[PDB]
Amino acid sequence: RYCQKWLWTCDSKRACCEGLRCKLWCRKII
Helix, strand or coil, X not given: CCXXXXXXXXXXXXXXXXXXXXXXXXCCCC
């Protein structure tokens, strides 16, 4: 049970879970 490589460069097209609230690397569990 893990997220979806939140580490992506969150911005819009991203597909994070609960860490897309950032500029690039999803600021999730890290």
